[PDB]
Amino acid sequence: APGEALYRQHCQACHGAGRLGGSGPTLLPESLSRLKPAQAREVILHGRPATQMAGFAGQLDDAAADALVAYLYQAPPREPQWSAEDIRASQVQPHPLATLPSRPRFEADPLNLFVVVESGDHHVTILDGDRFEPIARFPSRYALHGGPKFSPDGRLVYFASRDGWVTLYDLYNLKVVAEVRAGLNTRNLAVSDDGRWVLVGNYLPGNLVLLDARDLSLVQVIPAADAQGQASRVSAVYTAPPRHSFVVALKDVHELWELPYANGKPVAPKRLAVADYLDDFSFSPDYRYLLGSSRQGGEVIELDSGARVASIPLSGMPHLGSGIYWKRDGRWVFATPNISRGVISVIDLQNWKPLKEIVTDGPGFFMRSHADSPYAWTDTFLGKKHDEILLIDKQTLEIAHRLRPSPGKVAGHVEFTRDGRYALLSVWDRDGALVVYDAHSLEEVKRLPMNKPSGKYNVGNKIG
């Protein structure tokens, strides 16, 4: 085909042999699932503003650009592999933990640090959570995915990237400890509650990759396949601390997995049959129940027996993974945003009966709160109107307040300081910002300019 030859001559230098990546990102069909071919075409011709991807309009014509786009989105004749041997060969260890002191090199409170993902230019900022000033900034792997995870004591932070790279960062020494490429297209990762294991959930290959959390060395590649042998992508991996287990959502088979690690490296799944494909898990506070979205509403499964105990039909497809729990009149309640409709659904835990449907302007994506806050903070991140953060009173279940940090720009995602006194909102824009708010007065206290900040993650709240 003409695309391949054009690719070798003009592209392989940076995007690598087989489109696996190199200087530039991986360019497999899975890698480009969020990039429409017309957008890829414009990137190839004119480049990406303010990056190392320059335009090629002067080197190739319309037919050559179309040929290249067609090649990038075409499935290869055989699926690319990423073996145990590939994984081990990719490990690097610039600052092994054995060689580093175990003392914070800074004066900021280690438990109030924010890890801030700067997705516009693929950097990470480490923020002093009391001064709201950076103590470190470093370039990350391209297109971080899934939000960072922490070691149990909050000293170490683990990043996963779209194209399969895992990064271990030591917050005390402000240094990259190790990196490894666990797959070719990665969904997210999870850290065991005893701090020993990293479990990586991959789309490509369809597998789980188990790493030693101290140096990102390979422990075992676990192919994702149901009991009948049918291959599957991993949708997401989660930690269930009271069960000392990983819980795995599988994209393409009627199974979900629990991998216990109390007795050692979690290499053997306990398989639980599900009636329908189930991903985007949420866990009840006691981790006895799993709330998932089925390909057909919400499904409540008991983890031990795997029995389906209740079904909750809700408008549109609710984003159960982002839902949160709190006590309202001395009884657990659960609230979830929605991907296609503009509503916040509130469910009663005791009976799994819906309590109230709070109507909003548009579909949202994020939800957060704090023991010290009387509101649940959410958004309409996915709607046509999307510059407002909504504060839903935990008791009245109504939008009590609204926050509009940058009128006209996408506002979304909220994280608090460890004591809940301040809330940090992201304006997801090239001319974006991290906006600090007093969580009780609700007034803007500070604003940090950033290129498309996405999530920020408070050590204290993430490990508490």
CB-CB neighbours of 224 under 10 Å: 25
Please identify, among the stretches 40-48, 187-195, 243-251, 269-277, the one whose residues bind ligand HEC according to the rule CB under 6 A.
Answer: 40-48
How many whole angstroms separate alpha carbon 200 and alpha carbon 87? 12
Tokens 């979205």 identify what position?
293
Strands 165-170, 156-161: parallel, antiparallel or unpaired by DSSP? antiparallel
CB nearer to ligand HEC: give 68 or 312. 68
CB nearer to ligand HEC: give 22 or 242. 22
How many whole angstroms separate alpha carbon 371 and alpha carbon 388? 22
CB nearer to ligand HEC: give 8 or 88. 8
Strand, helix or coil for residue 46: helix
Residue 60 structure tokens: 């190739």
CB of 15 to ligand HEC, least distance (A): 6
CB nearer to ligand HEC: give 31 or 282. 31
Among 20, 28, 44, 124, binds ligand HEC (CB under 6 A): 44
CB nearer to ligand HEC: give 40 or 400. 40
How many whole angstroms separate alpha carbon 177 and alpha carbon 194? 19
CB of 27 to ligand HEC, least distance (A): 6
Q: How many residues bind ligand HEC (CB under 6 A)?
A: 19
CB of 176 to ligand HEC, least distance (A): 19
Residues contacting 275, CB < 8 A, separation 6+: 254, 294, 299, 308
Residue 425 structure tokens: 């909102």
Residue 78 structure tokens: 């055989």
CB nearer to ligand HEC: give 202 or 245. 202
Among 5, 8, 17, 23, binds ligand HEC (CB under 6 A): 23
How many whole angstroms separate alpha carbon 42 and alpha carbon 187? 26
Tokens 């041997």 identify what position?
85
How many whole angstroms separate alpha carbon 390 and alpha carbon 379? 6
CB of 165 to ligand HEC, least distance (A): 14
Interaction with ligand HEC in 291-350: which residues (CB under 6 A)? none
How many whole angstroms separate alpha carbon 202 and alpha carbon 160? 10
CB nearer to ligand HEC: give 28 or 221. 28
CB nearer to ligand HEC: give 72 or 346. 72
CB of 17 to ligand HEC, least distance (A): 13
Main-chain phi, psi angles of 321, to 5 degrees: -60, -25
Binding mask 46-85 toward ligand HEC (x if CB under 6 A, else -) reads --x--xxx--x-----------x-----------------
Helix (H) or strand (E) holding 90: helix 84-90
Tokens 């709070």 identify what position?
358
CB of 269 to ligand HEC, least distance (A): 32
Interaction with ligand HEC in 3-22: which residues (CB under 6 A)? 10-11, 13-15
Q: Strand pairing partners for 250?
A: 234
For residue 205, which amino acid is it?
P
Residues contacting 91, CB < 8 A, separation 6+: 178, 179, 180, 215, 216, 217, 218
CB nearer to ligand HEC: give 53 or 267. 53
Among 4, 29, 30, 40, binds ligand HEC (CB under 6 A): 40
Q: Is 410 in the site for ligand HEC (CB under 6 A)?
A: no
Please identify, among the stretches 43-51, 148-156, 255-263, 382-390, the one whose residues bind ligand HEC according to the rule CB under 6 A.
Answer: 43-51
Among 1, 35, 262, 359, binds ligand HEC (CB under 6 A): 35
CB of 36 to ligand HEC, least distance (A): 10
CB nearer to ligand HEC: give 73 or 132. 73
How many whole angstroms separate alpha carbon 314 and alpha carbon 219? 41
Q: Strand pairing partners for 292?
A: 299
Q: Nearest CA to 320 among 337, 303, 342, 306? A: 337
Among 43, 168, 213, 347, binds ligand HEC (CB under 6 A): 43
Give the residues lining the site for ligand HEC (CB under 6 A).
10-11, 13-15, 23-25, 27, 35, 40, 43-44, 48, 51-53, 56, 68
